[PDB]
Design a binder for this molecule. Structure first.
Ligand SMILES: [Zn+2]
Ligand SMILES: [Zn+2]
Ligand SMILES: [Zn+2]
Length: 178
């Protein structure tokens, strides 16, 4: 197995996947690495299994259909994995914890949002459709862009949104378009 966490790229107290060489801190994996379970298989492996059991699941889909899906176990897992892919980027730090807004010439968002809030919401089964998870993820970056206006820091929102959107299209097999 790898000697660094797949998500944050640091060493420490690492749990190793039994079916692949990846490793994780407990609370870096989503869901948090499970207490017992031998063997244990990481989210990467669990997602690959879904794909292998239903190869047709990789055929192109419309985003509107994907958003309306209920959060049954496979869609719950897919959202967990998508959230984890965002945390894999180091720039996710800016969006992880609860923000605050005191900048001359800007007013904070009406509905603040952050990654650890989406993480808690997934863990508490608060989303009934994929749309609820995707709307809160997009709101993170939209709030950022609106608040920072012309400051070049706005770019961090565009960057992390792009990581979200590419991973969304991959994980939910969104039909490719020009
Ligand atoms: Zn980690
Ligand atoms: Zn694995
Ligand atoms: Zn099948």
């Amino acid at each position: 197995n790898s000697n660094i966490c797949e998500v944050c790229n640091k060493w420490g107290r690492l749990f190793c996947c039994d079916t692949c060489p990846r490793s994780f801190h407990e609370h870096c994996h989503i869901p948090s690495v499970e207490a017992n379970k031998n063997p244990w298989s990481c989210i990467f492996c669990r997602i690959k299994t879904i794909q292998e059991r239903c190869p047709e699941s990789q055929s192109g889909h419309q985003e509107s259909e994907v958003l309306m899906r209920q959060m049954l176990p496979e869609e719950q897992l897919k959202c967990e994995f998508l959230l984890l892919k965002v945390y894999c980027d180091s720039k996710s730090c800016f969006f992880a914890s609860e923000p605050y807004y005191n900048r001359e010439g800007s007013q904070g968002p009406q509905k603040p949002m952050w990654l650890n809030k989406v993480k808690t919401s997934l863990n508490e089964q608060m989303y009934t459709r994929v749309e609820g998870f995707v709307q809160d993820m997009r709101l993170i970056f939209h709030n950022h862009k609106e608040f920072y206006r012309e400051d070049k820091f706005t770019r961090l929102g565009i960057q992390v949104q792009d990581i979200f959107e590419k991973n969304f299209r991959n994980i939910f097999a969104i039909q490719e378009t020009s």
